[PDB]
């Protein structure tokens, strides 16, 4: 199966907004976190079969400082501190990814901002099967 893109507009967001300010996003918009601890973006992600999947965030970080996020799958912490390092400009969009085990059906995937400047700007979450890799 082709990778599935979970667009910004389809997320459940908390202390974050959907905006269009910085060029280079895809689809209708991207998420801009409030500049505070604890904002999050959450998607309901389908897994056709149980197994290992790549979860890739397309993101921008126009500050020099890492904007780490806590990644949970169904509330389970799979990455306590996932790095979202500077991309240099707010219009430069890079990828940051992890491999995680998902269950057949829905998986609740959340990225929560750890530090006080909030999370990176997030364009989408891209999900594809990565059975060759093992979390």
Ligand X SMILES: O=C(O)C1=C[C@H](O)[C@@H](O)[C@@H](O[C@@H]2[C@H](O)[C@@H](O)[C@@H](O)O[C@@H]2C(=O)O)O1
The binding site for Ca(2+) comprises 7, 26, 29, 32-33, 35, 123
Q: DSSP secondary structure string, 51-110?
A: EEEEEEEEEE--SSS---EEEEETTEEEEEEE-----SSTT--EEEEEEEEE-SEEEEEE
Closer to ligand X by Cβ: residue 68 or 118: 118
Q: Which is nearer to Ca ion, 32 or 107 (CB)?
A: 32
Distance CA 132, CA 110 (A): 24
Binding mask 57-96 for ligand X (x = CB under 6 A): ---------------------------------x------
Q: 10 Å Cβ neighbour count for 60?
A: 24
Interface residues toward ligand X, by CB under 6 A: 21-22, 32, 35, 90, 118, 121
Interface residues toward Ca ion, by CB under 5 A: 32-33, 118
């Amino acid at each position: 199966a082709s990778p599935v893109i979970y667009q910004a507009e389809d997320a459940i967001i908390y202390n974050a907004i959907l905006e269009t300010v910085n060029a280079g996003y895809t689809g209708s918009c991207y998420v801009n976190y409030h500049n505070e601890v604890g904002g999050y973006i959450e998607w309901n992600v389908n897994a056709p079969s149980s197994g290992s999947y790549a979860l890739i965030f397309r993101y921008a970080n126009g500050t020099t400082a890492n904007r780490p996020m806590r990644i949970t799958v169904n509330g389970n912490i799979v990455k306590p501190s996932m790095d979202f390092v500077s991309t240099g400009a707010w219009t430069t969009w890079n990828e940051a990814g992890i491999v995680a085990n998902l269950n057949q059906g829905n998986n609740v995937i959340r990225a929560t901002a750890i530090a006080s400047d909030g999370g990176p700007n997030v364009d989408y979450l891209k999900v594809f099967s990565a059975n060759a890799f093992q979390p």
